[PDB]
Amino acid sequence: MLQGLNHLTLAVSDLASSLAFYQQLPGMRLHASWDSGAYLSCGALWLCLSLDEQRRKTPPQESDYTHYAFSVAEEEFAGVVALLAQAGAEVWKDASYYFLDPDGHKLELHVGNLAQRLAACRERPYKGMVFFD
Amino acid sequence: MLQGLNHLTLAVSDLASSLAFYQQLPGMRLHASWDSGAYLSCGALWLCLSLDEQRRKTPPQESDYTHYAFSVAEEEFAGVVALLAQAGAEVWKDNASYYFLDPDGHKLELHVGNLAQRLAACRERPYKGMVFFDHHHHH
Ligand SMILES: [Mn+2]
Numbered sequence: 333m334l335q336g337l338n339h340l341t342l343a344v345s346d347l348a349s350s351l352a353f354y355q356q357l358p359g360m361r362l363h364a365s366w367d368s369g370a371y372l373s374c375g376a377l378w379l380c381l382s383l384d385e386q387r388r389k390t391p392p393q394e395s396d397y398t399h400y401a402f403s404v405a406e407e408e409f410a411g412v413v414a415l416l417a418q419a420g421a422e423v424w425k426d427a428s429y430y431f432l433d434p435d436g437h438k439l440e441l442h443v444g445n446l447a448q449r450l451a452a453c454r455e456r457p458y459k460g461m462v463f464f465d
Numbered sequence: 466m467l468q469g470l471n472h473l474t475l476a477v478s479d480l481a482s483s484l485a486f487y488q489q490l491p492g493m494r495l496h497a498s499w500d501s502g503a504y505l506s507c508g509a510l511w512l513c514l515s516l517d518e519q520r521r522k523t524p525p526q527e528s529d530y531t532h533y534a535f536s537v538a539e540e541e542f543a544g545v546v547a548l549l550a551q552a553g554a555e556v557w558k559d560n561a562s563y564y565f566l567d568p569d570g571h572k573l574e575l576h577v578g579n580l581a582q583r584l585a586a587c588r589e590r591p592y593k594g595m596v597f598f599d600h601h602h603h604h
């Protein structure tokens with residue numbers, strides 16, 4: 333039986349460039365690096381960077397909505413966003429902040445879990461929404 | 466401070482096709498669905514499906530190595546892979562890991578072991594040019 337996400341692996345074109353970008357994020361931690369990848373963690377998240385020359389840096393309008401979001405407390409959301417604004421991180425769309433990584437992977441800062449989102453969705457459902465017990 | 470992965474959102478071309486696929490995985494559980502998306506959980510993972518016009522069934526050779534792996538216990542790895550083999554899930558890379566695609570071509574994986582165990586394995590035998598940053602006394 334599946335117990336959860338084991339690891340998230342992102343294909344990167346320049347490992348040193350990607351390592352600088354993720355090391356600036358508070359909570360991100362570098363455990364090891366080698367010639368074609370690196371191992372990082374962020375809380376329980378095991379993040380793996382994999383060097384891939386068949387990885388393009390893609391502008392956000394030319395990729396789909398697949399994105400990866402990281403948890404930030406409400407009291408610290410404003411701080412982290414200011415840190416990425418000062419760093420010059422490019423935003424790709426409009427309690428969330430959407431920013432890309434050096435290769436164009438769509439990332440997000442988000443406050444709230446799945447339980448708070450379903451509760452909000454109960455009080456105001458989307459079109460055709462069904463809840464399952 | 467970033468505390469961890471908040472949610473993983475996958476773009477899908479057929480929402481109903483995708484929910485059949487992910488619900489076939491034991492432990493994958495559906496909480497809500499609507500016209501253009503769904504909310505699922507798997508342990509602590511919050512998985513979100515988002516219906517997208519601009520999404521192709523991408524062949525594995527035409528996409529990069531970005532993939533998403535799910536944890537399975539050692540005693541149950543064979544069962545879950547056998548379940549996906551009988552279901553006909555397309556494999557995207559040879560072989561404690563099993564690499565399979567979802568109906569849109571998102572690269573997935575089942576894996577036994579965590580990052581602490583992989584780091585231990587890597588220190589017994591490192592990759593090319595590997596440098597470790599958690600202090601150890603392995604020789
Ligand atoms: Mn999101």
Ligand SMILES: [Mn+2]
Pocket residue numbers: 339341532534574576
């Ligand atoms: Mn993997």
Ligand code: NI
Pocket residue numbers: 588589603604
């Ligand atoms: Ni040894």
Ligand code: NI
Pocket residue numbers: 600601602
């Ligand atoms: Ni020591």
